[PDB]
Amino acid sequence: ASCWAQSQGYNCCNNPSSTKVEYTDASGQWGVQNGQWCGIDYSYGQ
């Protein structure tokens, strides 16, 4: 549990080691799914 995107108010990508990152910003890397932005965190998914 470390969704860094939460700081701004974004969701979290399920399984970060398997979600092709489509986003990329100072928030790290993200993934797009269902047409919604999610924060990809290596510590997330715990």
C-alpha positions as a printed NumPy array, in Angstrom:
array([[  0.   ,   0.   ,   0.   ],
       [  1.909,   3.084,  -1.204],
       [ -0.22 ,   4.61 ,  -3.988],
       [  1.757,   7.824,  -4.493],
       [ -0.86 ,   9.095,  -6.97 ],
       [ -3.211,   9.468,  -3.995],
       [ -1.382,  12.729,  -3.197],
       [ -3.215,  14.265,  -6.179],
       [ -6.31 ,  12.023,  -5.97 ],
       [ -5.753,   9.315,  -8.616],
       [ -6.597,   5.594,  -8.276],
       [ -4.036,   2.749,  -8.26 ],
       [ -3.205,   0.16 , -10.936],
       [ -3.822,  -3.44 ,  -9.823],
       [ -0.599,  -5.469, -10.095],
       [  2.043,  -2.917, -11.099],
       [  4.514,  -5.562, -12.333],
       [  1.978,  -6.432, -15.067],
       [  0.354,  -3.121, -16.083],
       [  2.041,  -1.545, -19.122],
       [  2.689,   2.008, -17.931],
       [  0.925,   4.482, -20.233],
       [  1.491,   7.466, -17.937],
       [  4.788,   8.853, -16.667],
       [  5.259,  11.926, -14.479],
       [  6.845,  13.075, -11.202],
       [  4.301,  10.659,  -9.699],
       [  6.36 ,   7.766, -11.056],
       [  4.724,   5.671, -13.763],
       [  1.023,   4.899, -14.22 ],
       [ -1.178,   2.549, -16.25 ],
       [ -4.446,   3.12 , -18.145],
       [ -7.393,   0.751, -17.676],
       [-11.127,   1.191, -18.348],
       [-10.166,   4.684, -19.565],
       [ -9.161,   5.817, -16.055],
       [ -5.749,   6.79 , -14.678],
       [ -4.319,   4.647, -11.882],
       [ -1.108,   5.123,  -9.865],
       [  1.395,   2.299, -10.412],
       [  3.358,   1.61 ,  -7.217],
       [  5.853,  -1.213,  -6.66 ],
       [  4.878,  -1.27 ,  -2.968],
       [  1.162,  -1.238,  -3.853],
       [ -0.754,  -4.528,  -4.202],
       [  0.155,  -5.63 ,  -0.657]])
